[PDB]
Design an enzyme around this catalytic site. Sequence first.
Site, PDB file in Angstrom:
ATOM      1  N   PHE A   1     -27.181  18.995 -40.282  1.00 62.43           N
ATOM      2  CA  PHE A   1     -28.451  18.445 -39.803  1.00 62.43           C
ATOM      3  C   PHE A   1     -29.581  19.421 -40.064  1.00 62.43           C
ATOM      4  O   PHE A   1     -29.454  20.630 -39.854  1.00 62.43           O
ATOM      5  CB  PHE A   1     -28.323  18.179 -38.303  1.00 62.43           C
TER       6      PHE A   1
ATOM      7  N   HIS B   1     -22.039  29.046 -34.779  1.00 63.44           N
ATOM      8  CA  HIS B   1     -22.255  27.861 -35.602  1.00 63.44           C
ATOM      9  C   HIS B   1     -22.731  28.171 -37.015  1.00 63.44           C
ATOM     10  O   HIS B   1     -22.417  27.433 -37.958  1.00 63.44           O
ATOM     11  CB  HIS B   1     -23.275  26.951 -34.893  1.00 63.44           C
TER      12      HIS B   1
ATOM     13  N   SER C   1     -21.009  21.423 -40.092  1.00 65.80           N
ATOM     14  CA  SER C   1     -21.671  20.792 -38.946  1.00 65.80           C
ATOM     15  C   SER C   1     -21.644  19.288 -39.060  1.00 65.80           C
ATOM     16  O   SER C   1     -20.537  18.738 -39.212  1.00 65.80           O
ATOM     17  CB  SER C   1     -23.096  21.373 -38.851  1.00 65.80           C
ATOM     18  N   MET C   2     -22.774  18.554 -39.036  1.00 63.58           N
ATOM     19  CA  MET C   2     -22.727  17.116 -39.230  1.00 63.58           C
ATOM     20  C   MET C   2     -22.105  16.754 -40.585  1.00 63.58           C
ATOM     21  O   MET C   2     -21.491  15.691 -40.713  1.00 63.58           O
ATOM     22  CB  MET C   2     -24.112  16.421 -39.160  1.00 63.58           C
TER      23      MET C   2
ATOM     24  N   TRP D   1     -19.321  18.599 -36.421  1.00 63.64           N
ATOM     25  CA  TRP D   1     -20.025  17.906 -35.344  1.00 63.64           C
ATOM     26  C   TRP D   1     -19.893  16.410 -35.573  1.00 63.64           C
ATOM     27  O   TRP D   1     -20.135  15.951 -36.694  1.00 63.64           O
ATOM     28  CB  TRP D   1     -21.503  18.290 -35.315  1.00 63.64           C
TER      29      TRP D   1
ATOM     30  N   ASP E   1     -19.429  29.145 -31.039  1.00 62.74           N
ATOM     31  CA  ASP E   1     -20.317  28.034 -31.389  1.00 62.74           C
ATOM     32  C   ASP E   1     -20.811  27.288 -30.163  1.00 62.74           C
ATOM     33  O   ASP E   1     -20.056  26.710 -29.386  1.00 62.74           O
ATOM     34  CB  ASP E   1     -19.576  27.110 -32.345  1.00 62.74           C
TER      35      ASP E   1
END
Length: 260
Positions: A61, A207, A129-130, A154, A175
């Site tokens: 993101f 993260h 992540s995303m 995520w 994270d």
Amino acid sequence: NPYERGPAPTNASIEASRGPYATSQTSVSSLVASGFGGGTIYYPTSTADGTFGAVVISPGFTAYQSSIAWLGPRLASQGFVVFTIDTNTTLDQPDSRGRQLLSALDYLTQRSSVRTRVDATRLGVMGHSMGGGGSLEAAKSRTSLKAAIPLTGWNTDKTWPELRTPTLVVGADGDTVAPVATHSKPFYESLPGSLDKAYLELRGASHFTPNTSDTTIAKYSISWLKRFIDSDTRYEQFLCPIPRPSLTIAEYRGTCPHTS
């Protein structure tokens, strides 16, 4: 095994910043890219050893290719065609990111200028992540993918019992953005029990640890791709028996021995 590439591996060769293959790169503009935001393809220069499997990698993101670029050369020099992509917008959600990973593989294998270097039957996905939540979405839609590696992933969807793709879940102990307690561990625990899978929790990491060169991420990512995209049983030794906790590894879980 016709897919074996490169010399017998050692712990030093999987930790090296540059593997045995010299590499080249090409850019794919967002104007030409159908269904994703363009990207950079990293590939072995040599065609003398045959074609290679391919991996596409998505950022997270509000992030761009610069956040995952270090994986390009690092993985490609081990004998992979690696495509780091930008998404349509930086606000795209995990399900959209999963569709863009598959569109980028389609582009790479069917239309790009390096499509003759790629074996289109041996593909994998990765993301941060995303983007990592998108790699799971992609493996849900395309169960013929050979490997999936979410890096501090995520996703609001926590359960993945449909997956048939060997998956290495990489989490970070510190994270606070995608806590392993509510994202990475739930993902790992919901995967089928018979699946070849593994959970790697980095020690002293955040993260953003995956956005800079990391030897631990690199060595296990290389081993995982070699083992499953190439079916290269010479790399099983780094994965099974599972590694013990160490300076860099907080925890590691896995189904050993692998049955792919």
